[PDB]
Amino acid sequence: MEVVLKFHSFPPMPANSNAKFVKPWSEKVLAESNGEIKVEIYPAMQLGGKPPQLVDQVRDGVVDIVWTVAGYTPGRFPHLEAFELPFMPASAEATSQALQEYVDTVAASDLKDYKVLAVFCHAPGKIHTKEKVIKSAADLNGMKMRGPTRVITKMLEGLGATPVGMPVPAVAGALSKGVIDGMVVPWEIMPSFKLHELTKAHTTVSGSRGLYTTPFLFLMNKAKYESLSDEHKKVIDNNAGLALAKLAGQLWDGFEVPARKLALDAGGTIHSLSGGPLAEMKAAGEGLEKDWIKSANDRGLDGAMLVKTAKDLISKYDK
Ligand SMILES: [Br-]
Ligand SMILES: [Br-]
Ligand SMILES: [Br-]
């Protein structure tokens, strides 16, 4: 029997998460169910609401599937904050597998009200400004810098910037209107919003750990999943879990390449921190890590254990 699943997300249709992740995912699900499981894709919040509401919509069955950024709803998924800490991430391939095993084990309570398809992340984000090259933390002093989540905006404050939080569709307008001077994002999301034309100076870090990442949630309504036939359940589950997280991370590592090329072809510079400037950023990061452990403790979680577990899972998959 045929079944229609409503997918909802915030980026426009050409963004990688839609065109190069959810669309081919839905095509595989269609092929492997012999045309029976039909995902209808609604990008750009085309079923109503604002990006932070995607988790409520999928939890309550307003829609059947969403892709979103966990930290767009602050405090709702506290375990996952550990993966947002400064200099936590390796490749998206390694860090996404770590995220999924984390969610399958010690962080499972965060997502108990949902059917998890995968939890994964982008390649470590970069620092973008209109024109000023960021050579060290001091260059961020007085700069109004966007981050995706409260953890990441606190990283930015710890580096000396004036933090501003917002979902990514708001960034281009905030840049054009002077609300922000720059932002952190991975390369891959930028062309969908013309962000590589609005910022020409870009900074990354050298070494084995990137600046930050933020967890993505790819989720299905639990009641809808439970209503599927055993046969349809197996198609979904064959396209879910650790193998999907790994594939997603591999995809997101690759997405950086064409997007970086667009940004440099548009006249951008890319500078990589090392040495003293990098060490200074990492030392600042350690402070936010310590503060996060306290914050996790105060919310009833073993912050120190969670940070160790995250780090050990990232190294486990860093092959
Ligand atoms: Br600037
Ligand atoms: Br928005
Ligand atoms: Br780069």
Coil, strand or helix: which one is 188? helix
Pair of tokens at residue 84: 């947002």
Closest alpha carbon to 203 in 107, 132, 97: 132
Which one, of 178, 186, 136, lies nearest residue 161 by Cα? 136
Rounded Cα gap, residues 217 and 117, in angstroms? 8
204: CA distance to ligand 3 center in Å? 6
Which residue segment(s) compose the domain that 297 sits in? 2-319
The total number of structural domains in the chain stands at 1
User: Do β-strands 37-42 and 3-9 pair in parallel, antiparallel, or remain unpaired?
Assistant: parallel
Other C-beta atoms closer than 10 Å to the C-beta of 54 total 26
Those residues with Cβ within 8 angstroms of residue 128's Cβ, 6 or more apart along the chain or in another chain: 182, 183, 184, 185, 190, 195, 199, 201, 202, 203
Question: Where are any strands of DSSP class E within the chain?
Answer: 3-9, 37-42, 65-69, 114-121, 126-129, 144-147, 162-165, 182-185, 201-205, 215-221, 269-273
DSSP label of 181? S
Do 88 and 215 touch, CB atoms closer than 8 A?
no
DSSP 15: S
Question: Phi, psi (5° rounding) for residue 172?
Answer: -60, -45
Tell me, letter by letter, the H, E, C secondary structure of 42-91.
Answer: ECCCCCCCCHHHHHHHHHHCCCCEEEEEHHHCCCCCHHHHHHHCCCCCCC
CA of 252 to the centre of ligand 3 (A): 13
CATH of the domain at 171: 3.40.190.170
- Cα(16) to centroid of ligand 3, in Å? 18
Token readout for 66 is: 């969403």
Which of 136, 268, 87, 118 has the alpha carbon at shortest distance from 190? 268
Centre of ligand 1 to C-alpha 141, Å, is 11
Q: Ligand 2 centroid to 210 CA: how many Å?
A: 26
Ligand nearest to the CA of 128: 1
Q: Do 2 and 40 touch, CB atoms closer than 8 A? A: no
Contacts of 312 (CB under 8 A, 6+ apart): none
* Cα→Cα distances 114→7, 60, 194, 280, 304, Å: 14, 9, 33, 40, 26
Taking CA 219 as the corner, what is the angle to CA 16 and CA 64, rounded to the nearest 5 degrees?
A: 100
Determination technique for this PDB entry? X-ray
Q: What span, in angstroms and rounded, lies between the C-alpha atoms of 61 and 224?
A: 8
Euclidean distance between CA atoms 95 and 249, whole angstroms: 7
Q: How far is the CA of 304 from the centre of ligand 2 (A)?
A: 33
Which residues have beta carbons under 5 A from ligand 1 (an ion)? 129-132, 181
* Chain mean position to CA 18: 14
Rounded to whole angstroms, how far apart are CA atoms 207 and 91? 12
Cβ count near 83 (within 10 Å): 29
HSE-up of residue 262 (Cα within 13 Å, Cβ side): 18
Tokens of 166: 């917002």
Resolution, given in Å to one decimal, reads: 1.6
- Written as one letter, the residue type at 151 is V
**Strand, coil or helix: what is 39?**
strand
Which residues are CB-contacts of 231 (< 8 A; sequence separation ≥ 6)? 33
Nearest to 16 by CA among 160, 140, 157, 193: 193
Distance of CA 36 to the CA centre of its chain: 30
Angstrom distance (rounded) from CA 284 to CA 273: 14
